[PDB]
């Protein structure tokens, strides 16, 4: 089906504790494959997936070179933002950036991205048209005007339409063993009496990949939208994910609840019931 590649960067100033820390990671779908941390002993972009290790020295030398310069630019940008916001040099601030592309089953560009956030809030973003910008405030408008005059959109567009999709396709072929394999969730339901009047029904989904998943409880076939505790999809640490959904049920009515699991790895959506 569809696939994506993303590069994530975040710089955090720490006044009086050296230069801003810079950390960037790369992903293809939900798989981390590259990383760079400025605080590392001898800072270099490192592989984090088997299928990227085959890349030669020129690849890594270039990536490393690129990450270091970005670290430098983020530093200059952090200073600029202090001005744009009339802020002190004494406080810590955060500059975040993400860019990447999405391609469909035909390996063709579906969507391209490039957005920035300052201290957790939206700052400036390249529009889906890959040629226009959206600034969140007047400070970000300063940037929009500089980028429109420098025609940054065109350079980004060129990359997103070309290299981005072409290297992604390359990574997809080289890591197809894992990147093009959906791991369906292994599921089951648990029962935990809470008192003589009620019990907890918990629907589990484990070892699944990718992360995208739908888990829902139904009471007499009606979605318990406003009565379902749903934890955030979490990583198992082995590359797969986990998740669960729970509902407090009146004891004796357990059989009126059904769990529904939807996942790219399942030929059909699953429906489970608590069966003692």
């Amino acid at each position: 089906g569809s696939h994506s590649m993303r590069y994530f960067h975040t710089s955090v100033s720490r006044p009086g504790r050296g230069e801003p820390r810079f950390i960037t990671v790369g992903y293809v779908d939900d798989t981390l494959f590259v990383r760079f941390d400025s605080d590392a002993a001898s800072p270099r972009e490192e592989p984090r997936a088997p299928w990227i290790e085959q890349e030669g020295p020129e690849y890594w030398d270039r990536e490393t070179q690129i990450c270091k310069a970005k670290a430098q630019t983020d530093r200059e940008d952090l200073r600029t933002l202090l001005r744009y916001y009339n802020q002190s040099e004494a406080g810590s601030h955060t500059l975040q950036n993400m860019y990447g592309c999405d391609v469909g089953p035909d390996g063709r560009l579906l969507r391209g991205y490039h957005q920035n956030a300052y201290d957790g809030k939206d700052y400036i973003a390249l529009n889906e048209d890959l040629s226009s910008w959206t600034a969140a405030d007047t400070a970000a408008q300063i940037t929009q005007r500089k980028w429109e005059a420098a025609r940054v959109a065109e350079q980004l567009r060129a990359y997103l339409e070309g290299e981005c999709v072409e290297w992604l396709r390359r990574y997809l072929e080289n890591g197809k063993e894992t990147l093009q394999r959906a791991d369906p969730p292994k599921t089951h339901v648990t029962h935990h009496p809470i008192s003589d009047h009620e019990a907890t029904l918990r629907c589990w989904a484990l070892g699944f990949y990718p992360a995208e998943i739908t888990l829902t409880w139904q009471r007499d076939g009606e979605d318990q939208t406003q009565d379902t505790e749903l934890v955030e999809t979490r990583p198992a640490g082995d590359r797969t994910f986990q998740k669960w959904a729970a509902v407090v049920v009146p004891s004796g009515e357990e059989q009126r609840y059904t769990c529904h699991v939807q996942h790219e790895g399942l030929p059909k959506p699953l429906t489970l019931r608590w069966e003692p």
Binding site: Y7, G26, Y59, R62, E63, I66, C67, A69, K70, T73, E76, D77, T80, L81, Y99, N116, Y123, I124, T143, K146, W147, A150, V152, Q155, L156, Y159, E163, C164, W167
Partner: peptide
């Protein structure tokens, strides 16, 4: 692979 062009805000 990452974009090469370096840009400042």
């Amino acid at each position: 692979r990452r974009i090469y062009d370096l840009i400042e805000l």
